[PDB]
Amino acid sequence: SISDTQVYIALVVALIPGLLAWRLATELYK
Amino acid sequence: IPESRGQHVGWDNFLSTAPHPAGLQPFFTGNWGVYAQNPDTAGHIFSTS
Amino acid sequence: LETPVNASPLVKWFINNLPAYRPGLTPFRRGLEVGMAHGYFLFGPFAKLGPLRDAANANLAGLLGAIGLVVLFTLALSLYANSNPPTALASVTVPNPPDAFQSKEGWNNFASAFLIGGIGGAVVAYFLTSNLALIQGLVG
Amino acid sequence: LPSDPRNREVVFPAGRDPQWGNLETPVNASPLVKWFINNLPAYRPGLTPFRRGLEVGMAHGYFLFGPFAKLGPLRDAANANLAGLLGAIGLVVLFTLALSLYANSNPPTALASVTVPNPPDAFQSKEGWNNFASAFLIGGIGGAVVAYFLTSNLALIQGLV
Amino acid sequence: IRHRDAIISHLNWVCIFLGFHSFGLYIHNDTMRALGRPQDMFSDTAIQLQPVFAQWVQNLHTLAPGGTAPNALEPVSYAFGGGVLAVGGKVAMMPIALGTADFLIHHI
Amino acid sequence: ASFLSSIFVPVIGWVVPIATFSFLFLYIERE
Amino acid sequence: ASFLSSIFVPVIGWVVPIATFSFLFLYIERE
Amino acid sequence: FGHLAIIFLWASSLLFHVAWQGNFEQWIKDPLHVRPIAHAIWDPHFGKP
Ligand code: CLA
Ligand code: CLA
Ligand code: CLA
Ligand code: CLA
Ligand code: CLA
Ligand SMILES: CC1=C(/C=C/C(C)=C/C=C/C(C)=C/C=C/C=C(C)/C=C/C=C(C)/C=C/C2=C(C)CCCC2(C)C)C(C)(C)CCC1
Ligand SMILES: CC1=C(/C=C/C(C)=C/C=C/C(C)=C/C=C/C=C(C)/C=C/C=C(C)/C=C/C2=C(C)CCCC2(C)C)C(C)(C)CCC1
Ligand SMILES: CC1=C(/C=C/C(C)=C/C=C/C(C)=C/C=C/C=C(C)/C=C/C=C(C)/C=C/C2=C(C)CCCC2(C)C)C(C)(C)CCC1
């Protein structure tokens, strides 16, 4: 499989849409 | 009566041990003569088996 | 209407002496006896009916389960507290509410003492069921 | 990443009075941060002053089991976790003094920042700070026992989960 | 008709109480066998639910000849006790033994 | 790194609905 | 009787300054 | 744009759960008998059989 290191890169990169999804879903109103 | 037969029954083991090997099944079925089976004989040395 | 179940004086005397309704108690004191009571028996169905009930850690399976569900109730008390709760009812067996169950501040005091008592009630049930032969040597 | 979008700003001043010494920044008034700080148990609406110090004591008494038990002098012995329990309980008591010492000195009134628009009204009286101090000792000792109970058998909870 | 709210809502509770504690013991046993946990089931082997109050009444109606009705010879039927009465090869009636599966389906 | 299943699945099983439902219940019941 | 070091040194190390400083802080801040 | 970005986040978990938990490189060697793998089970409620 993939290495143990590469899983943590995928988790940190996944915070970038996780932050932007929180910005879009709150710009669309409450 | 179990202490009379050399058989210790205290607060620790009275919920585990039964006074009769029949054990309350002849009570509700009406076969109460099981409770009057083989008594302590005429050679019963007290507090022994 | 009015029956010998909702209004017999044996039952009126009982329900007016539960810690939810006993007069003259701080809401910390009310949640303290309610917590210790409900933390005591809820050790029961986790320890002797749980998934690891035959193992050597059977009573510890019941301790972490019962503590871990008092924490779930304590959230639900604080969820009911923080929701601006409506004022409590007054039945035919209890003519008045205990006056600490209408403010948000009073349910928060009730919520914490449930957690303090509910954990302690589960630990003492873990202490008494793991030390059965201790007690029956202190008795016989 | 244009915000409103080529325009406008965020450092509008505090309460629209620029002559006050404070500003509204994305660390001051971003509504996830303002919602967080207003709902810590020091600041949450609807709490007894005994109720406020009860959560604050359970939180601060919890992690202070940590650095004593894993960095203290007895950290290789059989009493490695009991040395962290007596150090954590022994230092909540040093904080229970400092709360009672602060409370009895006729303490000043609490501030009102920009992320928290009011002090929680229980922090202006000597009797108010004393209930916060009595709760902190109860919750601080209890919060260190439950840290002692979990870490002393880490193999057991992981097997029981 | 005065207390018809007390009749229905106390009957509404029992229908709900019997729904979980009788049918949910099948859903419990569906899941424990599917999860490969046969020792956690409500069966004759793992967790007994023996019908004590109907295993007792069969033992009274088995022992009624000679006892509480001395004039009979065999019981009122062989469904309670007695023996196996074969007619040719096929069984006419055999003693019906109640167990854990018979506890669940009588409470369904 | 298969131990991340032990820390993401209980959070999504337990912590995610508890944090969501306790937010939504206090949001729908908000004057 | 060398065990008196175990009971005088922690009192003078811990208890004596805690009792002194908590008296003096409440005395200098006293209207 | 919100429903469109669910689709790419969905299709990325198909790639990641196969690269990390599936047997794609073992499936290249013989696709006619090697049986593919979607993801892995972490279920605490499982019994040992
Ligand atoms: C002159 C007075 C004095 C005395 C008697 C001590 C005594 C001690 N220090 Mg020390 N220390 C002192 C001054 C003093 N210190 C000063 C001035 C400093 C600042 C430079 C330090 C900084 C220091 C550090 C950084 C550390 C010590 C540690 C220790 C302990 C080493 C033995 C051991 O393994 O702990 C075994 C015993 C325990 C782990 C716990 C014992 C129980 C505690 C002390 C109190 C329990 C509750 C108490 C009864 C009530 C509340 C406390 C009370 C004072 C209000 C020992 C208790 C070590 C230690 O363990 O600290 C906790 C440590 O890490 N000291
Ligand atoms: C998808 C999320 C999820 C996860 C990760 C689990 C995980 C588990 N379930 Mg489960 N369950 C779930 C969903 C989930 N469940 C759902 C949706 C249902 C409803 C159908 C159930 C119904 C269910 C039952 C009926 C039972 C379990 C049980 C178990 C445990 C089996 C392992 C064992 O032997 O326990 C060993 C571990 C313990 C006995 C105690 C562990 C410590 C507990 C979990 C918490 C301790 C305190 C905690 C840290 C703080 C408070 C709790 C917090 C959530 C607020 C395991 C922890 C069994 C069990 O033991 O439950 C307690 C059990 O009897 N589950
Ligand atoms: C399979 C289909 C089905 C099911 C499940 C039900 C269920 C129910 N009907 Mg019903 N009904 C049905 C078909 C069904 N009906 C049909 C086809 C008709 C048309 C004529 C009716 C007409 C009808 C009427 C007219 C009445 C009912 C009533 C009832 C209730 C009886 C109480 C009870 O047993 O609840 C207990 C629940 C169960 C037995 C379901 C099993 C649930 C398990 C045990 C627990 C759930 C698992 C888990 C914990 C879930 C959480 C997971 C988590 C992740 C969310 C219950 C809600 C009566 C009622 O409400 O009064 C009591 C009533 O008056 N129904
Ligand atoms: C929507 C897409 C999606 C779905 C359904 C799943 C499904 C699953 N993942 Mg996975 N995953 C995905 C994308 C997805 N993955 C991506 C992109 C990554 C890289 C960051 C991962 C990284 C990952 C790890 C590291 C692990 C899982 C695990 C799991 C399993 C348990 C659930 C869990 O703990 O989630 C874990 C969730 C995350 C780590 C973060 C979620 C990331 C996506 C992008 C969020 C999507 C949110 C969604 C769009 C919101 C809409 C909700 C909808 C109801 C409207 C399950 C098979 C666990 C497993 O295999 O257990 C055996 C496990 O350990 N996933
Ligand atoms: C000022 C004089 C003085 C000084 C500096 C010391 C110094 C010391 N003594 Mg000692 N001692 C003295 C006089 C003095 N002694 C006298 C007169 C007695 C007889 C009562 C003792 C009996 C004594 C015992 C029994 C022990 C010590 C111990 C110690 C050591 C640790 C400190 C301690 O616990 O104090 C202990 C202090 C007392 C028991 C009482 C103090 C008595 C004097 C008269 C008080 C002086 C106060 C001073 C004048 C106030 C001014 C303060 C200044 C800053 C302005 C240290 C070497 C301990 C030791 O050796 O540990 C290894 C120990 O066990 N001492
Ligand atoms: C720091 C660090 C770390 C950590 C991190 C983490 C742990 C992460 C996680 C991750 C995660 C946790 C992620 C998340 C994500 C999320 C997402 C990505 C989301 C998405 C969503 C969406 C898409 C949305 C949508 C929507 C909208 C838009 C609207 C409304 C509706 C809805 C909601 C549906 C590690 C360890 C690695 C390493 C070291 C460093
Ligand atoms: C029989 C009967 C009845 C009754 C029932 C019930 C009601 C029961 C219950 C019971 C129970 C349910 C009990 C409980 C108890 C409890 C207890 C006994 C506990 C104890 C505890 C403790 C002691 C704790 C402590 C602590 C704390 C609090 C905290 C800290 C820690 C500690 C641990 C120290 C009735 C009347 C209805 C009817 C008739 C019959
Ligand atoms: C913001 C944030 C953060 C931070 C956070 C933290 C880190 C926290 C901490 C945490 C902690 C700090 C925790 C705590 C908790 C607590 C607890 C868990 C407690 C418990 C307690 C108890 C359970 C006790 C009880 C008791 C009492 C009270 C009395 C009597 C006795 C007893 C024992 C019963 C992070 C970084 C993530 C990132 C970003 C965001």
DSSP string, C29-66: HHHHHHHHHHHHHTTHHHHTTSTTTTSTTHHHHHHHHH
Which chains does chain A touch, 3 or more C-beta pairs < 8 A? F, H
**Can you tell me the distance from the alpha carbon of D103 to that of D131, in angstroms, rounded to the nearest whole number?**
10
First-residue to last-residue Cα distance in chain D: 45
Asked if E43 and E29 touch (Cβ cutoff 8 Å), the reply is: yes
Nearest C-alpha to atom 25 of ligand 6 is from which residue? A21
- Verify whether ligand 5 is closer than 6 Å to residue G9 (CB atom): yes
**Can you tell me the distance from the alpha carbon of C27 to that of C88, in angstroms, rounded to the nearest whole number?**
14
Closest chain H residue by Cα to residue A7 = H20
Residue written as tokens 């009930």?
Answer: C53
Residues in chain D followed by a break, C to N above 2.5 angstroms: none
Name the burial class of residue C67, with classes exposed (0-12), middle (13-18) and buried (19+) by CB atoms within 10 angstroms of its CB.
buried
Residue written as tokens 């820390």?
Answer: F7
Indicate yes or no: CB of B10 within 8 angstroms of CB of C136.
Answer: yes
Eight-class DSSP state of A4: H
Number of Cα atoms under 13 Å in the Cβ half of residue D57 = 29
DSSP bridge partners of D13:
D23
Q: What is the largest CA-CA distance in chain B?
A: 33
**Can you tell me the distance from the alpha carbon of H8 to that of H15, in angstroms, rounded to the nearest whole number?**
11
Residue written as tokens 């007596």?
Answer: D86
Backbone angles phi, psi at D13, to 5 degrees: -80, 165
Asked if A18 and A24 touch (Cβ cutoff 8 Å), the reply is: no
- Verify whether ligand 5 is closer than 6 Å to residue G12 (CB atom): yes
Q: How many CB pairs lie under 8 A apart between chains D and G?
A: 11
- Verify whether ligand 1 is closer than 6 Å to residue D91 (CB atom): no
What is the secondary structure of E71-88 as a DSSP string? T-SS-S-TTTSS--EEET
Handedness of CA E90, E95, E98, E102 (dihedral sign): positive
Indicate yes or no: CB of E35 within 8 angstroms of CB of H48.
Answer: no
SS3 of residue B16 by DSSP: coil
Indicate yes or no: CB of A24 within 8 angstroms of CB of H1.
Answer: yes
Question: D114 to chain C nearest CA, in Å?
Answer: 24
Eight-class DSSP state of E93: E
CA-CA distances (angstroms) from residue A30 to A22, B4, C11, C110, F29?
Answer: 12, 81, 50, 32, 14
First-residue to last-residue Cα distance in chain H: 46
Element holding F9 (H helix, E strand): helix F5-10
Nearest C-alpha to atom 61 of ligand 4 is from which residue? F5
What is the secondary structure of H1-49 as a DSSP string? -HHHHHHHHHHHHHHHHHHHHS-HHHHSS-TTTSPP-------TT----
- Verify whether ligand 8 is closer than 6 Å to residue C116 (CB atom): yes
Angle between helices C104-130 and C58-81 (to 10 degrees): 170
Nearest C-alpha to atom 29 of ligand 1 is from which residue? D73
How many helices and strands (H and E) does chain C possess? 6, 0
Name the burial class of residue E45, with classes exposed (0-12), middle (13-18) and buried (19+) by CB atoms within 10 angstroms of its CB.
exposed
DSSP bridge partners of E65:
E69
Residues 6+ apart with CB under 8 A from E54: E98, E102, E106
Nearest C-alpha to atom 57 of ligand 1 is from which residue? G10
Rg (CA), chain B: 13
Q: Which atom of ligand 3 is nearest to the CA of E27?
A: 44
Secondary structure percentages of chain D, helix, strand, coil, to 5: 55, 0, 45
What is the secondary structure of D71-119 as a DSSP string? HSTTTTSTTTTHHHHHHHHHHHHHHHHHHHHHHTT-PPPPP--SSSSS-
SS3 of residue D139 by DSSP: helix
Residues 6+ apart with CB under 8 A from D21: none
CA-CA distances (angstroms) from residue B46 to B3, B19, C140, D148, H28?
Answer: 9, 17, 22, 56, 86
**Can you tell me the distance from the alpha carbon of H38 to that of G11, in angstroms, rounded to the nearest whole number?**
68
Report long-range pairs for D29-35 (Cβ below 8 Å, ≥24 apart).
D29/D114, D29/D115, D33/D115, D34/D115
- Verify whether ligand 5 is closer than 6 Å to residue G14 (CB atom): no
Which tokens is E16 given? 């709900």
DSSP bridge partners of E86:
E91
* Burial state string for D112-143 with b = 16 or more CB within 10 A and e = fewer than 16: eebbbeeebebbeeeebbbbbbbbbbbbbbbb
Question: B23 to chain E nearest CA, in Å?
Answer: 15
Q: Which atom of ligand 6 is nearest to the CA of A17?
A: 18
**Can you tell me the distance from the alpha carbon of D98 to that of D92, in angstroms, rounded to the nearest whole number?**
10
Ligand 4 pocket residues where CB is under 6 Å: A 7, 10-11, 14; F 4-5, 8-9, 12; H 6, 9-10, 12-13, 16-17, 39-40, 42
Indicate yes or no: CB of C133 within 8 angstroms of CB of B10.
Answer: no
Asked if D68 and D88 touch (Cβ cutoff 8 Å), the reply is: yes
**Short-list C57, C69, B25, C27, CA closest to D158:** C57
What resolution (Å)? Answer: 3.3
**Can you tell me the distance from the alpha carbon of C93 to that of C5, in angstroms, rounded to the nearest whole number?**
9
Residues in chain G followed by a break, C to N above 2.5 angstroms: none
**Can you tell me the distance from the alpha carbon of C22 to that of C38, in angstroms, rounded to the nearest whole number?**
17
- Verify whether ligand 6 is closer than 6 Å to residue A21 (CB atom): yes
Name the burial class of residue D8, with classes exposed (0-12), middle (13-18) and buried (19+) by CB atoms within 10 angstroms of its CB.
exposed
HEC states along C66-79?
HHHHHHHHHHHHHH
Distance of CA D128 to the CA centre of its chain: 17
Residue type, C65: G
Which tokens is H3 given? 């429903």
Q: Name the structure determination technique.
A: cryo-EM
Name the burial class of residue D55, with classes exposed (0-12), middle (13-18) and buried (19+) by CB atoms within 10 angstroms of its CB.
buried
Shortest-distance ligand to the CA of residue H45? 2
**Can you tell me the distance from the alpha carbon of C7 to that of C94, in angstroms, rounded to the nearest whole number?**
9
For testing the chain A interface, which of H16, H17, H25, H26 should be mutated: the one with the most A CBs within 10 Å? H16
Shortest-distance ligand to the CA of residue E108? 3
**Can you tell me the distance from the alpha carbon of D142 to that of C7, in angstroms, rounded to the nearest whole number?**
43
Asked if D66 and D147 touch (Cβ cutoff 8 Å), the reply is: yes
Would an 8 Å CB–CB cutoff place B32 in contact with chain C? no
Which tokens is H4 given? 């469109």
**Short-list C27, C105, C99, CA closest to D45:** C105
